[PDB]
């Protein structure tokens, strides 16, 4: 570890300038990022259009934008546009899928599985087994391969990037291992979409608008391969359904904020326009710089290996400080936005809570140093 | 009577974007005021400045004011009120949480997707007695519920497919006398009918008569009932300590739209609920008078129904859906076409629905009547 300087990318500056000026310092795009002026305007415009021509007329007329959003998402995950459906977010997504699941309801997932995912799993009558992982919580693909062949399961649920830790999971290799054992794979890409390469052959993928794609809140996407989709049995309407519609049409049924969905379509568009690979390489870099700058802070140790290709960095207190209090202090006294991850976020992995930073492409080394500095003089 | 001059109507029109053509469809989706649109935009901007959840925390006063306004309209407490994605979200949250024996009675004109949610949640559904208009007969219902009791009564106080105002208050006390709680679907009724009627739970949608943003609804449950409920998510066997209402309000949502909504209900209170409702009743009367004499269409609602919903049944087998498309494409007039699926146990034939808000004029109603005559 001989420190390395930051790459200069105009991407960072373009991205900062495309969105409102931050009041203080925002290191929290893993919780909720920042909508561009274009995304905010497109949302506002739809709401105005609803008033001028009627809400549903407006919605019909927005079909091109909506479909473009499906198509953009589809391209990032290697699906077809018509496999992609809108939701309220990722927890909505997993519930739609698991509540629709036919036959034996068993699955395997990581021990670091997201608390509310486990909640949805249990609530849908699933039996849940842990996959083998190393000390960082990263799946051991070979071991998992053998385990799944001997002791199969109805599906594997992989959270490719966890909310509580910035480890990038070997999604692609695990997918082919599961497919070799004849088991479909669902991916929670709430953190991963717009961040990791999510084109990995999965059978279903879901994600949230408001995180790395910097879309409006209250939107998510769920993508399901046609072979799987047609096997599914939605909860509403009941399977003796007089109205004839496809599974995906049923899963997309319901009042929603249409303006926010067109907002989202603009946001994914901005990601494609910026260059997915370039954005991801930059986020990997942000993580490296973060872990380098924060390597030497009294009372905090960096959890992630330095070279993890993610922008999520988590800090564990070494003298029993409470992340939640530090976050409140950082906001109130320094205007620095972070997230405090409680144990409930990953109850079968986390033994102690952590402070999480999740900066986007626009963060500077100076800003990371300001955070480090503020973290030292915290009471 | 007829051409009442009401300043409310003009203020309401001018507080919102100019309509392109003619909008008679506030029962499907109304029109957000500039203030509501701006408040929504502002929250989204604030999320970008200070962080999404920081912004959400800071918006608590507005959000709580929205709960309090809703509470005042239904005669509940603010802390009984929870936000949802809409009314179908609401009914599902409630029915999926319902403890013990799952039986209910509802109207035959019950909303199709309500029946869907009922069936999906394992409820047995019995019809309430009604007159020829689909309006509940409270005395008969009283006897029926005493003889054959049920876990709850679900009343849609104003239907999507017909502008009959149900005697909610009378039915509520009849059910309470039989010891049976009452849930009210006030998607159409809130901001429209007096919804302060002693119900045990009430829900509604933002985008209709209150002219709020889409993707927001409210669900209100009395504390005695709320604490008996057993939410689906998280599972009841789970460790996380939160109230029932906290559980039902759990989830990613558009926070900006909720503050938008709080502004919208505020505008309703500010305008005077009673005055707005009296004006909507008037709009219905005028609509049915103007449309009384149209070839190929009969008016379904009695003229004096205190609602702004008027429905038209074709007398020579015209298809409402096609007429709606024509009206939009060729005349710029926005209506809704109600298919049988909207009330499958009442509707024998589909209908064209108009649902104008307070701002409609007699002239505009005549233009609609005229356009309806020269429709192919
Ligand atoms: C954000 C998050 C979720 C939940 O997403 P919502 O949009 O809030 O439902 C699930 N998975 C992970 C990894 C998360 O970070
Ligand atoms: C609009 C409507 C609903 C469903 O409302 P959503 O917000 O679309 O869920 C339910 N009841 C009636 C009377 C309706 O008209």
Author numbering:
A (entry chain A): -7 to 371
B (entry chain C): -4 to 371
According to the publication:
One of the key steps in the ergothioneine-biosynthesis pathway, the C-S bond cleavage reaction, uses the pyridoxal 5′-phosphate dependent C-S lyase to produce the final product L-ergothioneine. Here, we present the crystallographic structure of the ergothioneine-biosynthesis C-S lyase EgtE from Mycobacterium smegmatis (MsEgtE) represents the first published structure of ergothioneine-biosynthesis C-S lyases in bacteria and shows the effects of active site residues on the enzymatic reaction. EgtE and Egt2 are PLP-dependent C-S lyases in EGT biosynthesis, leading to the conversion from sulfoxide 4 to EGT. Each MsEgtE monomer has 15 α-helices and 11 β-strands and is classified into three domains based on the domain assignments of NcEgt2.
Because of the fast catalytic turnover of the enzyme in the substrate as described in NcEgt2 (32), it is hard to obtain MsEgtE–substrate complex by co-crystallization. A data set to 2.35 Å resolution was collected from a MsEgtE crystal with a short soak in the substrate. We observed an additional oval-shaped electron density in the active site, but it does not match the substrate (sulfoxide 4). Based on the catalytic mechanism of the NcEgt2 enzyme, we found that pyruvate, one of the products in the catalytic reaction, fits well into the electron density map. The complex of MsEgtE-PLP binding to pyruvate is constructed by a homotetramer composed of two homodimers with two PLP cofactors located close to their respective subunits, and pyruvate interacted with the interface of the A/C subunit. In the structure of the MsEgtE-PLP binding pyruvate complex, pyruvate binds in the deep crevice of the active center via extensive interaction with surrounding residues. Specifically, pyruvate forms salt bridges with Arg348 and Arg337, and also binds to Gln183 through a hydrogen bond. Besides, the carboxyl group of pyruvate creates hydrogen bonds with Tyr48′ of another monomer and water molecule. In the α14 of MsEgtE, Arg337 directly interacts with the carboxyl groups of the substrate's cysteine part and forms salt bridges. Tyr48 on α3 of MsEgtE, occupying a spatial position similar to the Phe48 in NcEgt2, participates in pyruvate production with the same function as Arg75 from α3 in NcEgt2.
